[PDB]
Design a protein around this ligand. Structure first.
Ligand SMILES: NC(=O)c1ccc[n+]([C@@H]2O[C@H](COP(=O)([O-])OP(=O)(O)OC[C@H]3O[C@@H](n4cnc5c(N)ncnc54)[C@H](OP(=O)(O)O)[C@@H]3O)[C@@H](O)[C@H]2O)c1
Length: 312
């Protein structure tokens, strides 16, 4: 069925989470409510998504109304690039906790391996700062030690950056949340993660078709669509079930009730082995390049290639 994965802390991580990037403050509450009512037990959040207060207000209502108990939900949030200095780390989590109306998060992630100055809404390369992941991770470890974050992890870390952190960390990252879908399979990183006991969690598992500045080609892939037609499932369902069968969690985002439901119905069927093999020939390209962190003169990362340590 593949309904959860065990983290290196022992915690059960539900395998399908509701994504909330680009879910507006006006729509995200009803989306979270609908998702939890349908059976989702995992919500992927971030301070930078601009909607944690609205998520918190609905979580409060769901708990009060006895739809779910806090202990049965898995809530992830992420430390934004402005808040990597160790002094700023616990303040950043405390703001997220206040907004989400929680006493702890189940998972707290370093969102990207980069620092940015406070004080611009927009990102400009002038505001990029030198990076110090070991120092930031030590501050994350204190949040884990105190129970404010029951698990800590990273996001957008290449194999090399994750390896470098693992070599020196006291608390190993529980999760590395990265772009992963049939057009960006991440087999190298997944294998490394598995060997080290780190769970890989897939963002943009549908290829983020609603993002205007990305090509919308993942759910249109002919191999994927043939499998969908043969099994009587939607292209999104096939993409999601594929991810589960590859051994990673998936974080599909929707603000539409029907799609939220559709995306969760990925446990009562499977992609048969021979059909599954066909996915291996889908052309590969990374959609989310992290170009906002890349600059020839002003950044620790002079190119996209450097940001991903060649994983492009
Ligand atoms: N750590 C990171 O740096 C990072 C980066 C990117 C994403 N993420 C996380 O991962 C989540 C998922 O990634 P994502 O939001 O980029 O994209 P995604 O989940 O791959 O795709 C979401 C898009 O697909 C549409 N959609 C959802 N279900 C569908 C279905 N059944 N059929 C057809 N279209 C469907 C949505 O529209 P509707 O909303 O209208 O249904 C939306 O436009 C994010 O929301 C966020 O939580 C993290």
């Amino acid at each position: 069925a593949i309904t959860f994965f065990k983290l290196n802390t022992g915690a059960k991580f539900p395998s399908v989470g509701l994504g909330t990037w680009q879910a507006s403050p006006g729509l995200v509450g009803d989306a979270v409510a609908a998702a939890v009512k349908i059976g989702y037990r995992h919500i992927d959040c971030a301070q930078i998504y601009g909607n944690e207060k609205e998520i918190g207000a609905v979580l409060k209502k769901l708990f009060e109304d006895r739809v779910v108990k806090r202990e049965d939900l898995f809530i992830t949030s992420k430390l934004w690039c402005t808040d990597h200095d160790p002094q700023d780390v616990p303040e950043a989590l405390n703001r997220t906790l206040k907004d989400l109306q929680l006493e702890y998060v189940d998972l707290y992630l370093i969102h990207w391996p980069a620092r940015i100055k406070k004080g611009s809404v927009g990102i400009k390369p002038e505001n990029l700062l030198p990076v110090d992941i070991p120092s930031t991770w030590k501050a994350m470890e204190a949040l884990y030690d105190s129970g404010k974050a029951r698990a800590i992890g990273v996001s957008n870390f290449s194999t090399k950056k994750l390896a470098d952190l693992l070599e020196l960390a006291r608390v190993p990252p529980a999760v590395n949340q990265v772009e992963c879908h049939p057009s960006w399979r991440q087999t190298k990183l997944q294998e490394f993660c598995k060997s080290k006991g780190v769970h890989l969690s897939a963002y943009s598992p549908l290829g983020s078709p609603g993002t205007t500045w990305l090509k919308s080609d993942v759910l249109k892939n002919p191999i994927l669509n043939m499998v969908a037609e043969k099994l009587g499932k939607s292209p999104a369902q096939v993409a999601l079930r594929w991810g589960l069968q590859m051994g990673h969690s998936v974080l599909p985002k929707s603000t539409n009730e029907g799609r939220i439901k559709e995306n969760f119905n990925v446990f009562d069927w499977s992609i048969p082995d021979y059909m599954f093999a066909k996915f291996a020939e889908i052309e590969q390209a990374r959609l989310v390049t992290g170009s906002f962190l890349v600059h020839e003169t002003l950044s620790p990362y002079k190119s996209i290639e450097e940001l991903w340590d060649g994983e492009i």
